[PDB]
Design a protein around this ligand. Sequence first.
Ligand SMILES: CCCCCCCCCCCCCC(=O)SCCNC(=O)CCNC(=O)[C@H](O)C(C)(C)COP(=O)(O)OP(=O)(O)OC[C@H]1O[C@@H](n2cnc3c(N)ncnc32)[C@H](O)[C@@H]1OP(=O)(O)O
Ligand SMILES: CCOC(=O)CN1C(=O)COc2ccccc21
Length: 411
Amino acid sequence: AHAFWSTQPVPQTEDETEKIVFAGPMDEPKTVADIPEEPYPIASTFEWWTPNMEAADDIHAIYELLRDNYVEDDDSMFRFNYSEEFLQWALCPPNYIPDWHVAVRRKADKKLLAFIAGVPVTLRMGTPKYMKVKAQEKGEGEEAAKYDEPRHICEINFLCVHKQLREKRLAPILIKEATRRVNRTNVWQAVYTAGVLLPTPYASGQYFHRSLNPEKLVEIRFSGIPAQYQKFQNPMAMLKRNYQLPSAPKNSGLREMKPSDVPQVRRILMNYLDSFDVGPVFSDAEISHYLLPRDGVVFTYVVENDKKVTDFFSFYRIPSTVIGNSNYNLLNAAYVHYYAATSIPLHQLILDLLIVAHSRGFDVCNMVEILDNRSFVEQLKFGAGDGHLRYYFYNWAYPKIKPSQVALVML
Ligand SMILES: CCCCCCCCCCCCCC(=O)SCCNC(=O)CCNC(=O)[C@H](O)C(C)(C)COP(=O)(O)OP(=O)(O)OC[C@H]1O[C@@H](n2cnc3c(N)ncnc32)[C@H](O)[C@@H]1OP(=O)(O)O
Ligand SMILES: CCOC(=O)CN1C(=O)COc2ccccc21
């Protein structure tokens, strides 16, 4: 039993989403008028709260909750520690709906107890490409293309319930209130990812990791020395040696992105992203927002030659609490953001990504095998990790697609 998710407009089994052919909603059509206006009911010792994410103090309250109760690895060794500046960036993109930030706090003391966030995204989510072959083979093309327009939908992230309130059916309530807040905005779909398995992903992929500073990584037990460095002399010298990287970017005319680069970056990004079944459409302002550099949060580099931007790469920082350990406090991880390459092999672009990230003192580079990510795993010495990021839609029938057919990076 999924007592909550069986009541929801998502596919219920693997046997379902295997036999789904066309993209489209699950539910009855409805209207804003059908949606209660009053927040969902809750125990009287609690209340709903809309944080103002342009207030240091609301942001901080969310920051503390996540720092202490947000996602942990399987082995309870590391926990995400999204910075404050990062939460402002992630939760307040252009035309964000403040109302989609849903928090529950105790009435008495106003201790924040749970949080879920929605942000707007414009997403291509019509029938995949392969499934549109099938639909010419069968004369069903107009059914298949029905919902090809980019849709303005909700991107849910940051679900979190305080450690003390777990197993108390509090996250379903959170999800119904967000659903409601977003329905009242005349939005009927959402996209979200989970480390865990839910009904029912349309795509799933491995996480990959790339040692930048293996000495710390072994120290904090993020990595072990693999059993074959024992047969060596000073094992940690070999390890350091294997993951060593140039001090400086290899592509001449790599430099940080600037505001004047926005249109060019947008363009080559959209042409690249367009070639995936599921992917975001960004306007200029979204491009400025998600990709212009911010100290400690997001780092973006472009390749210019002949005052011509031909390639870009970007990554964002999420530091993680090292949960055991007295020696070290934080894991300083970089995550491969969007990129696009037109003048150079992608592995050569992303190598400079690793170089920059290492010289800025990051410990590790992380990704999921979305995009053409898989195409540089071997040469750049990434290794698969434990677990899988799953991608899900709410109220949207979608066939199972490969993860290299997904172009949405989830913060
Ligand atoms: C159109 C508008 C739509 C907008 C909304 C779209 C949907 C948004 C969907 C949300 C996308 C979030 C994406 C992310 O942010 S993924 C990150 C999720 N957060 C964490 O992992 C942080 C650490 N963990 C926690 O804070 C809690 O364990 C959470 C909050 C995860 C569950 O709290 P708790 O452990 O106290 O459980 P409960 O007793 O209250 O509730 C039990 C029910 O919750 C179902 N559950 C467990 N984990 C997840 C999960 N990650 N997504 C969705 N559902 C989940 C579970 O199957 C069970 O239901 P059912 O099997 O009985 O049916
Ligand atoms: C062994 C993974 O450690 C991390 O890279 C950091 N991390 C966290 O701290 C929280 O749990 C995660 C889940 C999925 C991806 C990354 C992380």
